[PDB]
Amino acid sequence: LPVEYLQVPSASMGRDIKVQFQGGGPHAVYLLDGLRAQDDYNGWDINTPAFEEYYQSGLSVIMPVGGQSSFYTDWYQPSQSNGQNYTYKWETFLTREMPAWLQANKGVSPTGNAAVGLSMSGGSALILAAYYPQQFPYAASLSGFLNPSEGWWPTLIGLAMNDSGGYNANSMWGPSSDPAWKRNDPMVQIPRLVANNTRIWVYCGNGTNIPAKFLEGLTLRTNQTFRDTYAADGGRNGVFNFPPNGTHSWPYWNEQLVAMKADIQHVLNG
């Protein structure tokens, strides 16, 4: 399997970002990592046969490495508490720096790709497509935070980020009253997804500091109001997968990635 590991400089973050890569076509599936993203390998490669599954799919596969608790967004400032000595700029990296590098050196097109995220990055994928539709006519969110700015979600996200390497949500998007929370809220940005005619794939499995069943109910509720709002707002290009058997884990996230392969091939290469 022709898998490569790349070192892609990021001017905005002042360091090189490692990227796992598999070629196979000009358009690419960007596979974004979960909350506890490591600096050696992307979770998709640690936990799943993703590369092998998309081998000879006509699609390249990109797996950026690093960015624990980053939400693949551009932060306001370095995380204040855990000694981060630079500012996260992952939206800048994914939409400008990395595509530029991959085009010049490998001929991967900066346009007409898929963004696929899970847990932390599920919402990120949708937000990337909302604001960069030419880069991402396709986005998948597998167990993502679909309404990060509302209700319990700013508190829970902040707690999760602290539990994942001590990162501070306030350094990311500000107090929950800051415009940045709504800017990066996929439900709030549904009208953009509808206007861009983004092909979206949303998965919400069963299963899983607060009782499991309270969390489930918040999650179910949020995922249904996203779904309802998408349809109400004129959305006609979504797939919504809520299987009872489905779980919030790599084996079912891989199940969804394999399930969506034909969908992506047809939208990107059809």
Ligand-binding annotation for 201, yes or no, is no
Residue of 70, 119, 124, 176 with catalytic role: 119
Ligand-binding annotation for 173, yes or no, is no
97 is catalytic: no
Query: Resolution of the experimental model in angstroms, please?
Result: 1.9
Ligand-binding annotation for 225, yes or no, is yes
Number of other CB atoms surrounding residue 123 within 10 Å: 27
State the structure-solving technique: X-ray
So where are the chain's domains?
1-270
Ligand-binding annotation for 248, yes or no, is yes
Separation of CA 12 from chain center: 20
> How many Å apart are CA 1 and CA 52, to the nearest integer?
7
Kindly state the helix (H) or strand (E) to which residue 240 belongs, with its residue range. strand 238-241
164 is catalytic: no
CATH 3.65.10.10 assigned to domain 1-270? The reply is no
Which of 99-116 are b and which e, b meaning 16 or more Cβ less than 10 Å from the residue's Cβ? bebbeeeeebbbebbbbb
> How many Å apart are CA 144 and CA 57, to the nearest integer?
25
Ligand-binding annotation for 96, yes or no, is no
216 is catalytic: yes
Long-range contacts of 84-89 (CB under 8 A, 24+ apart): 84/167, 86/13, 86/14, 86/15, 87/13, 88/13, 88/172, 89/10, 89/12, 89/13
Ligand-binding annotation for 119, yes or no, is yes
Residue of 27, 121, 124, 248 with catalytic role: 248
Structure tokens that stand for 44 in this block:
């998709």
